[PDB]
Amino acid sequence: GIVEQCCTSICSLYQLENYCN
Amino acid sequence: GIVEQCCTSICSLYQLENYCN
Amino acid sequence: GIVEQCCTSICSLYQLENYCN
Amino acid sequence: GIVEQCCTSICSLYQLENYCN
Amino acid sequence: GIVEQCCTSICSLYQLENYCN
Amino acid sequence: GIVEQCCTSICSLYQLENYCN
Amino acid sequence: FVNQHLCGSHLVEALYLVCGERGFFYTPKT
Amino acid sequence: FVNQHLCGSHLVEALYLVCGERGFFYTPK
Amino acid sequence: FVNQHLCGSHLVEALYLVCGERGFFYTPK
Amino acid sequence: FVNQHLCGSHLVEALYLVCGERGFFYTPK
Amino acid sequence: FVNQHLCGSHLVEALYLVCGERGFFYTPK
Amino acid sequence: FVNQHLCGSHLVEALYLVCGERGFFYTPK
Ligand SMILES: Cc1cccc(O)c1
Ligand SMILES: Cc1cccc(O)c1
Ligand SMILES: Cc1cccc(O)c1
Ligand SMILES: Cc1cccc(O)c1
Ligand SMILES: Cc1cccc(O)c1
Ligand SMILES: Cc1cccc(O)c1
Ligand SMILES: Cc1cccc(O)c1
Ligand SMILES: [Cl-]
Ligand SMILES: [Cl-]
Ligand code: NA
Ligand SMILES: [Zn+2]
Ligand SMILES: [Zn+2]
């Protein structure tokens, strides 16, 4: 999920968009 | 929506809890 | 400036990119 | 109070020090 | 840069001012 | 203080409320 | 409008704190 | 873990900005 | 509108920065 | 430490919310 | 104007995220 | 890495407040 993926290394806004509804 | 419900007057803790999963 | 352009009305993340250097 | 003094006209960081312990 | 200088050890307000335009 | 108490293990809202006036 | 945009930014941070480990659902849809 | 708590606070604000009208679910688990 | 709440939210973060180790007091009076 | 500085910034925003009308004192010492 | 001050704070955080490694310039002038 | 990323978000907010009308350039490197 978002934590395991984005708190470990920087997520771009494109990568974050994956978590949008 | 939440902006309609909580942006004109402040929402209580109970009212915000409505949006928790 | 960015204040006049983005505080009077909402700026999309695409419009904010104009201020990246 | 700080709200009365600082929520209409911007308080300078200098002015804000009045609220430090 | 400012990251190297201020994210390892705390920078005072005066030191941050070093980075203003 | 609150730093020593809440900056390693997450403090609950009740634990935070102990620092209120 | 901008005011609702600024308000929403704070609402999500309040929900983050209020909800804790449960997580929350944010939809600006009227 | 507090570090994760802080990371999450920032993730939540980025999602708010990136997702816009679509909104989002923040499910830590 | 929730302007006073928003204002206080920012005042608190500015006091935190300005006051350093001295800390501060916030009273919505 | 900077981690402590960062943690504190979030703690005061949480206190601002939890304490509401009661207000709070932030005394890092 | 406090409302502009508050708007500006959010603008800076939006710029930080959108611009990333590129960095940004904030000249309210 | 993420720690630097989090720190940077707080740094730009501080610069916003400290620089005021002067403005600032944020260059992560
Ligand atoms: C914007 C953002 C916040 C926190 C972690 C990330 O990887 C990205
Ligand atoms: C911005 C904000 C925070 C908390 C409650 C509200 O109604 C609004
Ligand atoms: C993201 C953002 C913040 C504040 C104002 C805007 O127009 C846009
Ligand atoms: C406008 C914009 C910038 C960067 C990423 C996005 O998903 C959208
Ligand atoms: C720094 C700051 C925030 C909010 C209101 C003010 O007057 C000053
Ligand atoms: C105010 C501030 C934020 C982040 C790092 C610093 O050294 C100082
Ligand atoms: C809400 C909050 C912020 C920072 C540390 C904590 O333990 C709790
Ligand atoms: Cl605001
Ligand atoms: Cl942080
Ligand atoms: Na100059
Ligand atoms: Zn942070
Ligand atoms: Zn705000």
Map out the domains of chain H as residue ranges.
1-29
Rounded-to-integer distance, Cα B7 and Cα A4, Å: 33
Interface test with L, best of I11, I12, I13 (most L CBs within 10 A): I13
Interface test with J, best of H9, H10, H12 (most J CBs within 10 A): H9
Across the strands, what pairs with C20? K24
DSSP state of D20: B
Residue with the two structure tokens 């600032």: L24
Contact with chain B for residue I17, Cβ under 8 A: no
Resolution in angstroms comes to: 1.9
- Helix (H) / strand (E) containing D3: helix D2-6
Taking the CB of residue H7, how many other CB atoms lie within 10 A of it?
Answer: 20
The CA radius of gyration of chain K, in Å to the nearest whole number, is 10
What phi and psi values does residue F20 have, to the nearest 5 degrees? -75, 160
Residue with the two structure tokens 């403005």: L23
- What lies within 8 Å, CB to CB, of F20 at 6+ separation is J15, J18, J19, J22, J23, J24
Rounded-to-integer distance, Cα D5 and Cα H28, Å: 40
Across the strands, what pairs with J25? I25
CB-count burial class (<10 Å; 0-12, 13-18, 19+) for H2: middle
- Closest Cα in chain I, distance from residue D21 (Å): 5
Question: Ligand 2 atom closest to Cα of G13?
Answer: 3
H-only helix segments in J1-29: 2-19
Q: Which two tokens stand for residue K3?
A: 């409302």
Q: Which two tokens stand for residue H18?
A: 């990136």
DSSP state of A11: P
Q: Enumerate residues 1 to 30 of chain G having a beta carbon within 8 A of any beta carbon in chain J.
A: 13-14, 17
SS3 K27: coil
8 A C-beta contact, residue H13 and residue G13: yes
Q: Which of J5, J25, J28 is nearest to J15 (CA)?
A: J25
Q: Which two tokens stand for residue G5?
A: 């945009």
Contact with chain E for residue L26, Cβ under 8 A: yes
Q: Which of E16, L21, C17 is nearest to K28 (CA)?
A: L21
Q: What is the dihedral of CA I28, J2, J7, J13, to 10 degrees?
A: 20
- Closest Cα in chain J, distance from residue I18 (Å): 12
Long-range contacts (CB closer than 8 Å, 24 or more residues apart) made by F10-14: F10/H1, F10/H2, F10/H5, F13/G17, F13/G18, F13/J14, F13/J18
Rounded-to-integer distance, Cα H11 and Cα I19, Å: 27
Rounded-to-integer distance, Cα L24 and Cα L21, Å: 9
CB-count burial class (<10 Å; 0-12, 13-18, 19+) for H11: buried
Taking the CB of residue L1, how many other CB atoms lie within 10 A of it?
Answer: 8
Contacts of E13 in chain I (CB under 8 A): 17-18
Helices H2-19 and K2-19: angle between axes, nearest 10 degrees:
100
Interchain CB distance below 8 Å, H7 and L9: no
D3 → closest Cβ in I8, I22, I24? I8
Regarding the beta carbon of G10 and ligand 2, being less than 6 Å apart is answered yes
Contact pairs from chain H to chain K, CB under 8 Å: 4
Tell me the pairing of strands H24-26 and G24-26: antiparallel
User: CA neighbours within 13 Å on the CB side: how many for G20?
Assistant: 8
8 A C-beta contact, residue H7 and residue A2: no
Q: Which of H16, H28, J11, F10 is nearest to G21 (CA)?
A: H28
H-only helix segments in A1-21: 2-6, 13-16
DSSP state of E7: S
Rounded-to-integer distance, Cα G17 and Cα F8, Å: 16
- What lies within 8 Å, CB to CB, of B18 at 6+ separation is none
Interchain CB distance below 8 Å, I5 and B8: no
Rounded-to-integer distance, Cα F3 and Cα F1, Å: 5
Q: Which two tokens stand for residue D17?
A: 């020090």
Contacts of L2 in chain J (CB under 8 A): none
Residue with the two structure tokens 């508050």: K6
Rounded-to-integer distance, Cα I19 and Cα D18, Å: 9
Q: Which of K27, K1, K2 is nearest to K15 (CA)?
A: K27
Interchain CB distance below 8 Å, L11 and E2: yes
